Amino acid sequence: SLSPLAQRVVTQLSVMSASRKQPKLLKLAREDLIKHQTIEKCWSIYQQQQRERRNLQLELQYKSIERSMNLLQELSPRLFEAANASEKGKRFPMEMKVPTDFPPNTLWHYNFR
Amino acid sequence: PKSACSLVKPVHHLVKIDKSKLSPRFPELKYDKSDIRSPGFKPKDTHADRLNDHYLNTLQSDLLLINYSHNAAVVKGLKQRAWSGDSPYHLNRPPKNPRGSKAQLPDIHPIKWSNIPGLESVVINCFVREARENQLLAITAALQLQQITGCKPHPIFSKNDVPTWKLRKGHQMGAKVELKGKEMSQFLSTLTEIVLPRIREYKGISNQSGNRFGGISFGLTAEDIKFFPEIDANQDSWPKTFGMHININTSAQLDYQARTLLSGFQFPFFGEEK
Amino acid sequence: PKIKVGVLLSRIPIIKSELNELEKKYYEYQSELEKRLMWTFPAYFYFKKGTVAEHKFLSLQKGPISKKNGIWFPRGIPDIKHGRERSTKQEVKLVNRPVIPNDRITEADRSNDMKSLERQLSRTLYLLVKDKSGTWKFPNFDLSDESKPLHVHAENELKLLSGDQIYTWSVSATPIGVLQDERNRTAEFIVKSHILAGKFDLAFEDFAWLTKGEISEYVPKDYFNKTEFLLADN
Amino acid sequence: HIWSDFTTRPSSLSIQSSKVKNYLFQKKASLDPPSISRRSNRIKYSPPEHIDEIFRMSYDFLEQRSSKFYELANKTKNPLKKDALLIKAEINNPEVQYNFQFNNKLNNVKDIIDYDVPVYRHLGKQHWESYGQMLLMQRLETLAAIPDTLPTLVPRAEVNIKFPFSTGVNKWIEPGEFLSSNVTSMRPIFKIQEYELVNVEKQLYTVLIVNPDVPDLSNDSFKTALCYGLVNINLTYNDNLIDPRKFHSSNIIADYLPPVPEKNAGKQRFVVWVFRQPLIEDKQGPNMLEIDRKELSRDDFDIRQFTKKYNLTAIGAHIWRSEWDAKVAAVREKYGLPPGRVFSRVRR
Amino acid sequence: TRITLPRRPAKKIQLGKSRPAIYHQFNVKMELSDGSVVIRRSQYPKGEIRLIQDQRNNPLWNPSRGSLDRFNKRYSSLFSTVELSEENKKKTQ
RNA sequence: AUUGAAAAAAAUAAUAUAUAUUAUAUAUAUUAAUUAUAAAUUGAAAUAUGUUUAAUUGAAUAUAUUUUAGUAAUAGAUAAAAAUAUGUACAGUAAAAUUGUAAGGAAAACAAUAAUAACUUUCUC
C-alpha cells in the first residue's frame, strides 16, 4: 500500500493539516460577547492613543530638527553643510542589540576594542 | 445565452448598496474575521512583540534623524510622458512609455514623522527543484517552513514548462509563506540571533542586494536550516532539508534606507554599496 | 552669537519594557483564547510510538474522560479526536541544566545608584550633568574652532571628559534641536549619540544616568519643556 | 464613575434586567449567564478565562473617557454638536450596547431603547444603514420607483408600512412585495422612524402613496394616481406610528383608495413617499399649510410639481406592488368603484 | 516515474466556516551563549533550550567585545604560544 | 427537570410546537451543531470491578467495558499553476519589462515597481 517514506510524508502532512486536530467553535453568551467587545474596543482605542503619542513625538522631533538646521544655515554655513550630508551607508552599531526578555550575566561591558 | 453584451446600468441614488448584506446566504461570512462570532476568528495581539517594541522605542527616532535632509523636495519617478500636440495624430494617442523603463516608477518622498521606514512583510520562498521527480519533497519542504515560522505555508506550483531542466507545468514544488506582524518579527529575531551566527563564513547580506524601492533579500542553504531550533531539536526527524529565499519587504522609499533599518535590527551588511 | 554643542548620551534598554497593568491582563486573556482555539498537539509526530522519550511524555500527561454508555455526563458528552476534549482547552505538560533567567531588577536599582548604567534595564537612560551652579543639564561644550563637524567635536569632548573610558556612537551629523536665549547671546546645538560600552565617571561637578520621568525632577521646568520630546518615554 | 450616575442621565442607558447587570459587574466569574435559560446548558457552558478583571479595566477606561467627553458636552451650546458629544460619551457604554443589540428596534419599548436619547438614535440609524436602508434603495432603483415618480431619494427616516385593518394578520411589508387585493383592501399604517436631530414640536410631515402605473389610453402610456394623501402629521422619536388614532380628517388631502389593478394592465407599483415640512422661523408652534383641494387631482397627479409647490423634501420611502387577482372586482364593488377594465393579453 | 501521493476527494470547506490554522505552540525559553534568556513561541515540545553558538558570542555581532577534544585527551601528558614559537620556522614554504 | 456555581421576560436568525389569513405570518419555548462518516490479533486514553502499598486518597498492577489512532493537503467566496468548456449569483484583474534573491545560469520560483486632491469613520495637537 505505502512505503515507510510515504508514511512519514503523510505524518508530516498531518502535522500541518487541520484534519481532526481542531476544537469546537468558541461560542459565547450575549453578556460575555458584550464584555469581549468592550475589552477589544477599549484596547483598540488605547493602541490608537499610543500611536498618536508616538507619532506626535516624532513630529515634534522633526520640527525641532528643522528649527535647528535653519538656525545652523543662518549662522555657520560650513557647520550646516557638515550636518546636512548624505548618510546613505549609515549602519547602526552591532552593540545596540534588540532588548531580550531577561538580562545577561554580565549586564554591561566597561572595556572595549 | 441571448447575448454576451456586458453593460452596467446607471443608478438614481448615491447610497452604496452592499449586495452581500441583502442576501441571507452566508451569515457567518457577514461578520468580520476580527469579530469573535466569526469562525475565522483568531487572537491577534496575544503577546507583546519585542522587535517591534524596540523599533518603536530606540530605532524609529534615530532613523528619522538619519533621513532628515534639509528642505528636501519630492523626487518624481519616471512616468508615462504625454505627447506634445504638434500634430493632429497626437489627439487620442496613448502616452509615450517612460524614459528608460517600460513600466512607471514611483515618486521618492522626503522622510518625515509619518513615512519613516519600517518592516512591512517577510516572504520565505522555497522552491525545491528535486520535487520535479518527487512530490513528497515539496510536502517536506512545506512542513519545514511551517516549523520554522509557526505560520501556514502555501504550496508553490510549476508555472512554466522547460525541457533542459526536467520541469513540467502544474506540478507542486516547494512552498512559500508571507509572514506579517508578530510572527514575522519573531522569525527575524531568530535569524539574527540563532541561525545566521551559526553559518560559518557569513559576512552578511550584500549591499548590492535589493529592489530599487525598499525590499532586501538573501537565501539560506540546506546546511543553514538545521540551525533553526525546531529543526535542530529532532535531527532524526529531519533527514532531508531544503534551502530557501527570504524576501524582506520594508516601508522604505529607497533601498539604502531599508538596509539601514535592517542593520538597526542586527543584520550585518558586507558588500560595496551602489 | 556663540555656537555651543549640546550632547545627550542615550543608553538604550537592554531588556523588554515592563507591561502596563491593563496590557498584561489583556495579553493573558488573548493567550487563553488562543489556547481554547488551539489545535491538538500532534504527539504522534514529535514522539515515535514504542520509544523511551514518548513514554515519559505520556507519564507527564493525563488523558481525557471518554464517553461510556449508560452514564450521565452533565457537561455534555465527550467529543474526542487524537485524545483531546474538543469542547475545552488542552494543556500539555513537558549541558543538561534548568534554564534559570536572571532578575530584571538589579543591585544598582535596589541601591538607587544614579551614576551606574545597570540601574534600569527596561528603560532608556540619558546622561545628565551638573555644572558649577545648582542646575542640571545635558553636557554643553564651547565650539571655538568651528573647523571640524559638530557631532565629531561633541564626541571628542565627551572622550576628553571620560579619559577614554566611554565608547559612543553618533546617530547622525544632523542636530536634534537647539537651546537658545537672549541674556547670553548663544546657541546650543544638541547632538544625539549612543553610549555603547564604557564608563563616564569624569567644568562639571556631578553627573547621573536617568529616565525621562526622573529628568523632570532634576532639571528646570522651562528646560524640560524645551527638551521633553527629544527623550524617549520608555 | 459617570455611567453609574442617573441624576441627569436618562434611565434607558442602564440595563433594566437586574440579573444581567449583576452578571456584567461582578468581582469573580462565579455566576452563570441569564441568557442561558436552561440549567443543564448553564452547567455545560464555560466562559473564557480571565475575562472579568480585564473587562472591569476596559469599563473604567471607557467610563473615564465618557466622563471627559461629558465635561465638554455641557459647555457646548449649539445642539447638533452637543448631541454628537453625548453620542461619543455613551456609545461605548456596555449597558447601552446590550440594550440596543438584544431588544427590538422596530417596536422599541421606551424604557429599554429610547430614541429620544441621542446615542440610541445614532445606533438605530447605524443599524438601518447596515441593511434595511440599502434594501429599500435597491427596491426603489430596480423597480424604477425613483425616476418614474420622484427624481432621487436621500434616505433619512426609516419608513415601515403595515395593513392591519383588512385581514387581521400582523406583518411589516418588505419593500417590493406582491400583496393581494384582500390584504391592501383597507388603508395601511406607517411608521416613520427619524434618526436625525429634528425639532419634534415644530416639524410636520406629509405622506403620499402614488401609483405611477395606471394606464392612460389617450396618451398610450401611463399616468400617476395619488392613492392616499396625508399632510401635517406630527411625529415623535418614540411616538411615530401614523394611525387613524393620530391624524385627523383635516389631515387627509386624499383618503385611501385601494389598489385595483386591471386584468393584463400589468404589475402596478405603489410607492409611498414621506416628506418633511418646510420649517419657518420666528413662529412658535407647528406651522401648518393649506392644500388647494380642487387643484390637485387623483386620477392624474404630478408628484414633482406638488413637491415644488409646497417646498417638500422627501426623507423616506417604501414600496409594494399589486397586480390583478380574483378579489379586485369585489374590492371595487365594496368601494363602489366601476366594474374595472380588461386589457388584451398581448402588448401589441 | 514521478513519485507522488495520489489525492483523495477534497473536503468541502463551506464559505464562512473556514477556520484559521492555530497550531499548537509552547512558550520556549532560549538562554543564549551568555545568560540572557528570551521567551519564544515554538511548535516543538521543549520548555527550555540553552544555545552554544549565538550572535552574543560571535565576533561579527560584537566586534568591540569532537576530534580536537579527543586529540587534547590523548596528548595531555605532553601539554602540546611557546610550542607554536618552537615549531614555526618561516624560511621554508 | 435532577446535577455545578453562589418570581420571570423584552433583538435578528435557526430549531420545536401551535394557530392566524384566498398574506411563506404571528405566538411560546430553547440557543443545538459547525469539518465529521464503515472496516483496525499490534499503539494511546478513560471508566468500572479486584489486589497490593503510604476508613482515606495518591501510586502500582490485572480483567471487563468503552473511547480514541485509518494519522492525507483546500481553512479563502480562494482570483491568471493545473483541473467540469453549457445556467445563474457574487467578486476581482491580466501581461510584459525592470530591480533583486540558496543551488539558479538567456531560460525554473518568490518578492517588489503610477497618482491621493476631495469624502466618511476613528484617535489626537
Distances from the Cα of B226 to the Cαs of B205, B222, E49, in angstroms?
Answer: 20, 7, 15
Rounded Cα distance between C83 and C79, Å, is: 9
Helix (H) or strand (E) holding C193: strand C186-195
Contact A62 B143 (CB under 8 A): no
CA nearest to C10, candidates C144, C117, C150, C131 = C117
Torsion-angle region of A46 (φ positive above 0: left; ψ -120 to 50: alpha; else: beta): alpha
Rounded Cα distance between B261 and B254, Å, is: 11
Contact list in A for residue B263 (CB cut-off 8 A) is 91-92
Helix axes B255-264, B60-67, angle to 10 degrees: 150
Contact list in C for residue D48 (CB cut-off 8 A) is 29, 32-33, 36
Tell me the technique behind this structure. cryo-EM
With a CB cutoff of 8 Å and minimum separation 6, the contacts of C168 are: C9, C155, C158, C159, C193, C194, C195, C196, C198
- C-alpha cell of C161? 571628559
Task: Residue C178: count other Cβ atoms within 10 Å of its Cβ.
Answer: 20
Letter string b/e over residues B114-130, b meaning 16 or more CB atoms within 10 A of that residue's CB = eebbbbeebbbbbbbee
* Total length of chain A: 113
Contact A104 E5 (CB under 8 A): no
Q: Which residue of E has its CA nearest to C34?
A: E22
Contact with chain C for residue A88, Cβ under 8 A? no
CA D76 to chain centre: 30
How far off is chain C from A53, nearest CA to CA, in Å?
Answer: 10
Strand partners for E48 = E29
Beta-carbon-side half-sphere exposure of residue D77 (alpha carbons within 13 Å): 0
PDB resolution in Å: 3.2
Contact list in B for residue E13 (CB cut-off 8 A) is none
Contact A75 C187 (CB under 8 A): yes
- C-alpha cell of B99? 524614459
Cell numbers 451650546 correspond to D77
Q: Which of A32, A42, A45 sits opposite D33 (nearest CB)?
A: A32
How far off is chain D from C197, nearest CA to CA, in Å?
Answer: 41
Residue B158 contacts strand F, CB under 7 A:
yes
Contact with chain B for residue C38, Cβ under 8 A? no
Helix (H) or strand (E) holding B222: helix B222-225
3-state secondary structure of C53: helix
DSSP state of C123: S
Report the C-alpha dihedral over residues A26, A32, A37, A39, rounded to 10 degrees: -100
Helix (H) or strand (E) holding C195: strand C186-195
Contact with chain C for residue A83, Cβ under 8 A? yes
Contact D102 A35 (CB under 8 A): no
3-state DSSP percent of chain C in helix, strand and coil, to 5: 25, 20, 55
Rounded to a whole number of angstroms, the CA Rg of chain C reads 29
Residue pair B151/B181 in contact by the 8 Å Cβ criterion: no
Contact list in A for residue B265 (CB cut-off 8 A) is 98
How far off is chain B from A21, nearest CA to CA, in Å?
Answer: 15
Rounded Cα distance between B107 and C8, Å, is: 35
Q: Which of D34, D47, D97 sits opposite A37 (nearest CB)?
A: D97
Three-state DSSP string of chain D: CHHHCCCCCCHHHCCCCHHHHHHHCCCCCCCCCCCCCCHHHHHHCCCCCCHHHHHHHHHHHHHHHHHHHHHHHHHCCCHHHHHHHHHHHHCCCHHHHHHHHCCCCCCCCCCCCCCCCHHHHHHHHHHHHHCHHHHHHHHHHHHCCHHHHCCCCCCCEEEEEECCCCCCCCCECCCCECCCCCCCCCCCEEEEEECCCCCCCCCEEEEEEECCCEEECCCCEEECCEEEEEEEEECCCCCCEECCCCCCHHHEEECCCCCCCCECCCCEEEEEEEEECCCCCCCCCCCCCCCCCCCCCCCCCCHHHHHHHHCCEEEEEEEEEECCCCCHHHHHHHHCCCCCCECCCCCC
Task: Residue C30: count other Cβ atoms within 10 Å of its Cβ.
Answer: 21
Letter string b/e over residues E70-86, b meaning 16 or more CB atoms within 10 A of that residue's CB = eeeeeeeeeeeeeeeee
Letter string b/e over residues A37-48, b meaning 16 or more CB atoms within 10 A of that residue's CB = bbbbbbbeebee
Rounded to a whole number of angstroms, the CA Rg of chain D reads 25
CA E27 to chain centre: 18
CA D329 to chain centre: 32
Cell numbers 576530534 correspond to E67
Residue D327 contacts strand F, CB under 7 A:
yes
Helix (H) or strand (E) holding B247: strand B244-250
Task: Residue C73: count other Cβ atoms within 10 Å of its Cβ.
Answer: 11
Q: For residue D96, which phi and psi values (nearest 5 degrees)?
A: -70, -35
Rounded Cα distance between D229 and D256, Å, is: 7
Torsion-angle region of C173 (φ positive above 0: left; ψ -120 to 50: alpha; else: beta): alpha
Cell numbers 457537561 correspond to C75
Nucleotide nearest to D108 (CA to C1'): F10
- C-alpha cell of B215? 525590499
Report the C-alpha dihedral over residues B183, B189, B190, B191, rounded to 10 degrees: 110
Q: Which of B46, B61, B68 sits opposite C30 (nearest CB)?
A: B46
Q: Which of C15, C44, C87 sits opposite A11 (nearest CB)?
A: C44
Chain D 167..196 CB hits on strand F (< 7 A): 167-173, 179-180, 182-183
3-state secondary structure of A92: coil
Q: For residue E3, which phi and psi values (nearest 5 degrees)?
A: -80, 125
Rounded to a whole number of angstroms, the CA Rg of chain A reads 28
* Whether A and E touch (3+ CB pairs < 8 Å), yes or no: yes
DSSP state of C38: P
- Dihedral (CA of E59, E65, E66, E67) sign: positive
